[PDB]
Design a protein around this ligand. Structure first.
Ligand SMILES: O=c1ccn([C@@H]2O[C@H](COP(=O)(O)OP(=O)(O)O)[C@@H](O)[C@H]2O)c(=O)[nH]1
Ligand SMILES: O=c1ccn([C@@H]2O[C@H](COP(=O)(O)OP(=O)(O)O)[C@@H](O)[C@H]2O)c(=O)[nH]1
Ligand SMILES: *[C@@H]1O[C@H](CO)[C@@H](O)[C@H](O)[C@H]1NC(C)=O
Ligand SMILES: *[C@@H]1O[C@H](CO)[C@@H](O)[C@H](O)[C@H]1NC(C)=O
Ligand SMILES: *[C@@H]1O[C@H](CO)[C@@H](O)[C@H](O)[C@H]1NC(C)=O
Ligand SMILES: *[C@@H]1O[C@H](CO)[C@@H](O)[C@H](O)[C@H]1NC(C)=O
Lengths: 521, 521
């Protein structure tokens, strides 16, 4: 089928259809997109059937077409192509067509378990499911330029076909052309930004809940082929817990439960997931391994430990994950506040912390500072100094800190979890008015229950009625339990009121407002 | 199939994956989404495999999940669903599973030709091509509630399956369930906003060029199975050119060859497209019929006539279409300034203008204003009254206006049109410095051509070099013809200079900057 594919490519050229009005929110569908392995450049070939949506002109370099990773607007993770006429193929090597449909993306840091899960694995899972056929047919192409990395077998779980690295493309041919390729990863599952513009923290508008996290974790547990106990997630190289043996005995005594230790180094990852998946409580130093908390059962507790001078309020990727609506996880943060219990490593090279390379004046300033100031990514000297300390955990202060959230037995001790759904609009809202005196009037409002309430058993159903006089800039709310109400002493005669009605399930599930009612007295 | 389909729906529930961080930029892929034809509500069933991305909570009602039409954030064009547990299906009739994969959207105004093409046809065409398999296997579901409309056969040209309107779903069953549904329309092909928040005009950031318009027009011409001349697009019901015959011979006299006439009422649309298809020039009054200028051949001229009191620059849906990059059309506008040559109809009813039913004082102001003021959409009596008046075109005034833009014979003749593409980054930029004294210093820069230029012949190739002293907030640019240069004047010794390089094709095709060059002197 090569002469037919070469003919379509040489006559018609590249076809590009993309979602999104900005580059930070863009997914592209390509046909006959090409790639030079010598230049490491993707190629758009203009032919007689070529389409480019969006067609940006020179705005395609301000800054680029789309983000290749899920890190927003990272200036080393952009995607773009160079343009050529389809006829320019007459002067080029013969193209080598890739048969598989491709999903093209960059992995932001395939060596960090948190980056792997939050930036790549979750977005890959749902970007594949954004388009029909991808989840079963797509071969992934990782174009960021790093090797396999320490977690490459995790990437292999998301696709049935072996992923390809950019370095592997040059052995496939000098000119490669994808008959069908998707480019980009959706940011819909992300919950954290790493501090390039403003200091790191939760992303402003999180669009993912624990249910979608757990559906992903359920898929990975099946692909990994996966009595109550507390689990301590230790580190063996750096950011250590120095009194680990004392911590395990105390936790076992405080909660009357078995306490088990796991680490990324000494256990196959399937066994790591298996241990986490049935743990009533996860205790761990702040670090990449804590992203595995997404495998915790609903109702379990996350106990995150922070080293000296590291404010837990400033470094919240795992707090944000654990407290996502729908995750149903308890979050406890503990910070070492005793300098005699921290171990400093200042004679390390700058990469691993250590401050010996800076002048003596800044070294004293760092050692005296009892809290890492707010900073931007990525190599702030003080932050790396403190975040790579060793920590002796003060047991009694940790136990009292945990007991402020977990007041009884930790874990999912026979608790049930509803699904949280919202009401519809109330239907057929009406109103009537009457006047009994120069200053006495009545305004009655009535409505039918939301349609989905006919098939719902809700513990508490209320209606909020917003009342506003026509000229006023104000509205007054009223909470009612019946489907009707007659306003009396708040109503003026010979005037007009606007009425908005919405239904509220329990107390926090706010429904939508119906069409406004105009009611004149 | 059906018993396996019902068990997936009742156990698993609805699955939803959507692009975009806002409702105004969102397309949704649904599996096991349902519709109650009685309540006229879509239903998300919560089951043990349900996915909701984005998961907005009550912000799903602020204001909705997505725009169902392409008119951004319109009050009455929102899409949403009501939520129910998957177990509720036991209390409903057995569902009717829609076989075909669906694309669900709202037509904004199926009775207006401009709205049909701009808001519906073009977005439908590329939204279908955004997702694999949609263009061949999808059935269109129009939920806005209108009937077929005046142009329903145009809609049927975009799908091999007969589209269904909302009113027909009640006959299919009380509860309808889509195994695979897509919801929403891309806005990437839009170029005009009709004036709901600010006076009407072109959309701010147009993402579509004339190429994608012509690829769409080439498709309709095939499905419609479609001696140089000038074409006058006539109106026969309202907003008519009174002196059609006088105008018609004048263009024959002032230019070269025939000037014929065409009308939406008296030809089949296939003949209307065919006559516009080979028209060297199209003259017409402002109206929906002018949207057919997208079928004009490369190089034609569009002459739009405006009633006496309407500003040509205040209403530019077809000026924006004609002057789109890649359309390669000349645009000519003419406004009637001689008030003797306009006749008006003050006592036609609400929908076709007239100072009827308005205050006599409000009349006089409309009687007096020589210019309809800038206004918000859908209600201005002066705009309607002044736009539905018939005009005697002053041939002397208009022929001058065309001759300013059309210097000789109108139409393409046999002009050349080549695709305008942009340079790649310059490759392997280098610098070296020299110091001749404590005030003199020489900075040399060199680079290789952009990779795609190795397969291009370009008339003018230039390079712009930006020099910034590190730490300073200023820069000086240099336009150069060679791939190397030695800077001398104003170069400070013992400094660090930041060097940016980009290539430019034919003055106006600005390419991207390469990675910054750090140069120490
Ligand atoms: O003692 C250690 C230190 C690190 N890592 C892993 O090695 C990677 C890099 O660790 P780093 O400290 O850079 O990440 P952080 O924990 O600060 O997110 C991550 O996947 C860690 O889980 C580990 O397994 N043991
Ligand atoms: O004399 C007329 C007036 C209108 N229309 C068509 O009827 C619809 C409504 O036109 P209207 O005047 O309401 O809007 P406008 O033409 O200003 O866009 C459009 O498809 C017009 O092309 C037509 O064919 N002839
Ligand atoms: C492009 O070229 C092919 C081959 O000649 C032809 O079939 C097709 O109609 C041309 N135009 C488009 C828009 O594809
Ligand atoms: C008001 O609503 C309640 C239920 O909420 C109903 O029992 C009662 O009959 C209603 N009254 C009127 C007048 O509609
Ligand atoms: C949903 O439940 C069915 C049986 O009711 C089971 O086979 C399936 O694995 C479950 N899926 C998930 C994601 O829990
Ligand atoms: C500079 O660039 C030109 C091409 O523009 C090239 O011919 C020449 O060899 C380069 N080097 C010098 C020293 O001119």
């Amino acid at each position: 089928d090569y002469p037919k594919a070469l003919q379509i490519l040489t006559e018609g050229g590249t076809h590009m259809v993309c979602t999104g009005r900005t580059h930070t929110d863009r997914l592209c569908r390509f046909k006959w997109l090409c790639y030079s392995s010598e230049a490491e450049e993707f190629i758009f070939f203009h032919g007689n059937a070529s389409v480019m949506l969006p067609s940006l002109g020179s705005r395609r370099f301000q800054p680029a077409l789309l983000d290749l990773s899920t890190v927003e607007d990272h200036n080393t993770q952009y995607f773009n192509f160079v343009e050529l006429p389809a006829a320019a193929l007459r002067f080029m090597p013969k193209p080598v067509f890739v048969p598989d449909v491709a999903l093209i993306a960059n992995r932001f840091n395939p060596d960090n378990l948190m980056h792997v899960f939050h930036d790549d694995l979750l977005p890959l899972f749902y970007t594949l499911r954004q388009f029909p056929g991808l989840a079963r047919e797509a071969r992934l192409f990782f174009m960021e330029g790093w090797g396999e990395g320490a977690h490459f077998d995790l990437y292999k779980l998301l696709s049935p076909k072996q992923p390809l690295l950019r370095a592997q493309l040059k052995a496939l041919g000098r000119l490669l052309c994808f008959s069908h390729a998707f480019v980009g990863l959706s940011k819909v599952t992300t919950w954290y930004q790493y501090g390039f513009v403003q200091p790191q923290g939760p992303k402003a508008n999180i669009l993912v809940s624990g249910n979608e996290i757990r559906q992903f974790a359920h898929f990975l547990m099946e692909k990994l082929n996966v009595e109550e106990y507390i689990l301590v997630f230790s580190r063996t190289q750096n950011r250590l817990i120095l009194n680990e043996a004392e911590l395990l005995l105390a936790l076992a005594q405080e909660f009357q439960m078995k306490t088990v230790t796991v680490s990324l180094e000494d256990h196959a990852f399937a066994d790591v997931v298996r241990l986490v998946s049935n743990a009533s409580m996860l205790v761990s130093m702040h670090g990449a391994q804590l992203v595995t908390a997404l495998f915790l059962p609903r109702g379990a507790a996350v106990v995150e430990l922070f080293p000296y001078a590291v404010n837990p309020d400033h470094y919240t990727p795992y707090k944000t994950l654990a407290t996502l609506p729908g995750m149903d996880l308890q979050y406890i943060a503990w910070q070492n506040t005793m300098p005699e219990n921290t171990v400093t490593h200042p004679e390390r090279p700058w990469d691993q912390g250590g401050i010996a390379h800076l002048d003596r004046a800044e070294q004293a300033r760092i050692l005296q500072s009892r809290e890492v100031p707010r900073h931007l990514c990525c190599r702030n000297p003080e932050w790396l100094f403190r975040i790579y300390q060793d920590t002796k955990v003060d047991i009694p202060s940790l136990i009292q800190t945990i007991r402020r959230v977990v007041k009884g037995h930790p874990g999912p001790r026979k608790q049930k979890w509803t699904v949280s759904l919202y009401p519809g609009k109330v239907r057929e809202a009406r109103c009537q008015a009457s006047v009994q005196g120069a200053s006495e009037a009545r305004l009655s409002v009535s409505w039918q229950i939301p349609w989905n309430l006919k098939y719902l058993k809700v513990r508490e159903v209320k209606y909020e009625v917003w009342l506003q006089e026509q000229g006023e800039n104000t509205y007054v709310p009223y909470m009612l339990a019946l489907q009707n109400h007659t306003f009396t002493e708040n109503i003026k005669p010979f005037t007009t009121y606007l009425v908005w009605i919405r239904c509220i399930f329990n107390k926090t599930l706010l429904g939508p407002f119906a069409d406004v009612l105009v009611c004149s007295t």
